[PDB]
Write a protein that binds this ligand. Structure first.
Ligand SMILES: *[C@@H]1O[C@H](CO)[C@@H](O[C@H]2O[C@H](CO)[C@@H](O)[C@H](O)[C@H]2NC(C)=O)[C@H](O)[C@H]1NC(C)=O
Ligand SMILES: *[C@@H]1O[C@H](CO)[C@@H](O)[C@H](O)[C@H]1NC(C)=O
Ligand SMILES: *[C@@H]1O[C@H](CO)[C@@H](O)[C@H](O)[C@H]1NC(C)=O
Length: 225
């Protein structure tokens, strides 16, 4: 995150940290005691989904034993994700077991199917991503205040944003992290236009996948084999 402030512990308790061999690859949000919503695109590979999921974190550098919760991924689900054009970049992770709902870990609610957010609306995005193109991750979470742009510079499958001050927005490590507006997860950080903090951050429209998500939540099994 570029152009933002440092958060306080438990300021965003829904927040997840997806890791690989202990290193932070992407963000996410806890949407159900057993699922984490994130970007499908975090899911390229080079050691594919052999990842972990850390809840309750703050300082990426410490163990924070009495606040964190660690989990492995039993399954992963997506709806028509397409990498060439980045369409439908959304994926749900099923945790090996129920997350204990504490003061440092909570659920982020979801908008109803087909809902919308008008241009000009104020939202926030937060994460442990870097502050500059190809730069170190942030050890603590940071957040910035965003504003939803007019539909003509976005895309239908997305919900775009900008900052009144040059430089603000997502950056490396911020992928999968949620855009919250009006206390609901209206977005899933996908990709960004050019130099971090420059102009039009693209987020996946969560309101389009609502019934599908409900679908997965309701019949929790690993899928066919
Ligand atoms: C949400 O909106 C869509 C479009 O207004 C409604 O139906 C559409 O969905 C059908 C099933 O996918 C499609 O066959 C149409 O192509 C499709 N159009 C778009 C572009 O998606 C849908 O009924 C609405 N649902 C509710 C719950 O409001
Ligand atoms: C709460 O969940 C944790 C982490 O998943 C688990 O190890 C623990 O047993 C649960 N706590 C209580 C006191 O049972
Ligand atoms: C968020 O917005 C509020 C209200 O405009 C403001 O007081 C605060 O500085 C903003 N924070 C960031 C981190 O941009």
């Amino acid at each position: 995150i570029v152009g933002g402030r440092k958060a306080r512990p438990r300021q965003f308790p829904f927040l997840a940290s997806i890791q690989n061999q202990g290193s932070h690859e992407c963000g996410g949000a806890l949407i159900h005691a057993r699922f984490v919503m994130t970007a499908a695109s975090c899911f390229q590979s080079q050691n594919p989904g052999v990842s972990t999921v850390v809840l309750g974190a703050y300082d990426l550098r410490r163990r924070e034993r009495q606040s964190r919760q660690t989990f492995s991924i039993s399954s992963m689900s997506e709806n028509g994700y397409d990498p060439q054009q980045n369409l439908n970049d959304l994926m749900l992770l099923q945790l090996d077991r129920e997350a204990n709902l504490t003061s440092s870990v909570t659920i982020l609610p979801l908008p109803l199917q087909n809902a919308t957010v008008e241009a000009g609306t104020r939202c926030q995005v937060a994460g442990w991503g870097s502050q500059r193109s190809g730069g170190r991750l942030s050890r603590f979470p940071r957040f910035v205040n965003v504003t939803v742009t007019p539909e003509d510079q976005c895309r239908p499958n997305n919900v775009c944003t900008g900052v009144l001050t040059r430089r603000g927005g997502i950056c490396n490590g911020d992928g999968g992290t949620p855009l919250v507006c009006e206390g609901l997860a209206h977005g899933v950080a996908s990709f960004s236009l050019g130099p971090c903090g420059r102009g039009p951050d693209f987020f996946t429209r969560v309101a389009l996948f609502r019934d599908w998500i409900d679908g997965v939540l309701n019949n929790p099994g690993p899928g066919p084999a």
